[PDB]
Amino acid sequence: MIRNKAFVVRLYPNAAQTELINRTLGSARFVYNHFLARRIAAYKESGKGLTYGQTSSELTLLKQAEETSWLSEVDKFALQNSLKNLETAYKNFFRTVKQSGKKVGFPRFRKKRTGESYRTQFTNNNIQIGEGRLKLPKLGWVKTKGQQDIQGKILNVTVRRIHEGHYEASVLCEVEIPYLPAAPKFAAGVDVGIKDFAIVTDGVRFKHEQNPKYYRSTLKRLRKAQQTLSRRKKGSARYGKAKTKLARIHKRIVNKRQDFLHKLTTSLVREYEIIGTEHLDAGWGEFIRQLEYKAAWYGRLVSKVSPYFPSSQLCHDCGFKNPEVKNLAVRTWTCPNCGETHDRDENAALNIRREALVAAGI
DNA sequence: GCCAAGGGACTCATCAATAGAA
RNA sequence: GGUGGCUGCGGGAAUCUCAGACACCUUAAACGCUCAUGGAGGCUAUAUGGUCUGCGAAGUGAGAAUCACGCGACGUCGUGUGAGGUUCAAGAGUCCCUUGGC
DNA sequence: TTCTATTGAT
Ligand SMILES: [Zn+2]
């Protein structure tokens, strides 16, 4: 019943806290690079990889050294977790060395990039959560907007810089999540359509989860923005402004899609005991990920149809397969075996529901 | 050699000691 | 007078308040804006068609777009601090890889 | 000066 859960809140640090955040990110990156180089040199020297303990000790001697004493300014937890990041990169590489086929590459030097994070643990109430405030080590109280009810025991806080002037902190808390009570409906079947994002059916009726309002309208504004950027010559300030506006429109599209999927998946979890989706505008990967983790948290069970199931071809009533349904132009078709005409999307959702129950076994 | 966006695999600290301060 | 929406802030989405503007006349559709410069093109639908434009299109440079309070400068501007309604929803981190663009 | 916040070693 106790789950690792993350609460993302937007940070609004003042000038000094922003300076300290940037210093901490730089220090973490420098430590990662330096001790990657040190491990490589050690393997070249003695043929034995340095343990995390040996890398930790040299960091402590690095901190006291005059040439690298500046690391004392930033939080210790950030540097040590950067060292743990290096160790995990090495661990991934070592695990994949034996395996054939897909192989994790050797760790590479960390480079300056817009999205960087530093992670600080919790100990002796150094992290405290108030109403509209958040306390982080070495920083003090920082004002947070959109702070939900944060419960459980705080484990660590990940301070992330999405882009310049945009900071988000992901507070990891070990919160107990109570199971949702019995759902009004038993099971659902979910599809993919062109005009409609999905066709959710409980068996009594079909509910068309159409695309969110203004989604097609926003896609129009996406096309307009690209035209202006394309004709604009590169390197101009107005070209930069057009690129920023295009980036903002992309961000709005992503946010609207995520909100639509979050509300839809929460509704599916609350409304149906068992949810069944075929595994494959779509954004299907995030939909499946959210459905699976929310079902695990709230006690629902997700049954994913085997991709070998050709639901669209089969008729729900009789199971006859028709090659005509393979053609997309055939939105409405009649099954000669069952002598019935049914909508393609409606027939697909009912079949996906039927297979979802079979896989769960009920 | 340089940036952005997706995807798959694995995972999500604790405590004794100690310096300092309102 | 009534109706709709483009752009900006209000954690995300819708609504709404306000603001930059504006369209039309009971139908809701379309479009962010200002200044300077620029010198015939710009947008949409199905190679074809429609609309804007030369008392100025694309492109380039600059700027403003909620509220309260303090400070400085010349009623005005610059700066910092603080605040922003109602309803629904919010699981992230690390590593490598892939793709796209330079 | 006892409570608060940070550090090094696992
Ligand atoms: Zn049939």
Residue numbers in the entry: 1 to 280, 297 to 378
What is the paper's account of this structure, in its own sentences?
TnpB associates with a single, long RNA (ωRNA) and cleaves double-stranded DNA targets complementary to the ωRNA guide. TnpB from D. radiodurans ISDra2 (hereafter referred to as TnpB for simplicity) consists of 408 residues and has a similar domain organization to Cas12f, which is the smallest subtype among the type V Cas12 enzymes. TnpB adopts a bilobed architecture consisting of recognition (REC) and nuclease (NUC) lobes, which are connected by a linker loop. The REC lobe comprises the wedge (WED) and REC domains, and the NUC lobe consists of the RuvC nuclease domain and the target nucleic acid-binding (TNB) domain.
We reconstituted the ternary TnpB–ωRNA–target DNA complex by mixing the purified TnpB–ωRNA complex and a 35-base pair (bp) double-stranded DNA with phosphorothioate modifications within the DNA backbone around the cleavage site and the TTGAT TAM sequence, and analysed its ternary structure by cryo-EM. We obtained a three-dimensional reconstruction of the ternary complex with an overall resolution of 3.2 Å. The TAM-containing DNA duplex (the TAM duplex) is bound to the cleft formed by the WED and REC domains, whereas the ωRNA scaffold binds to a surface formed by the WED and RuvC domains. The TNB domain (residues 327 to 359) is inserted between the β5 strand and the α4 helix and contains a CCCC-type zinc-finger, in which a zinc ion is coordinated by four conserved cysteine residues (C331, C334, C351 and C354). The ωRNA (−116G to 16C) consists of the 16-nt guide segment and 116-nt RNA scaffold, comprising four stems (stems 1–4) and a pseudoknot (PK). The TTGAT TAM duplex is recognized by the WED and REC domains.
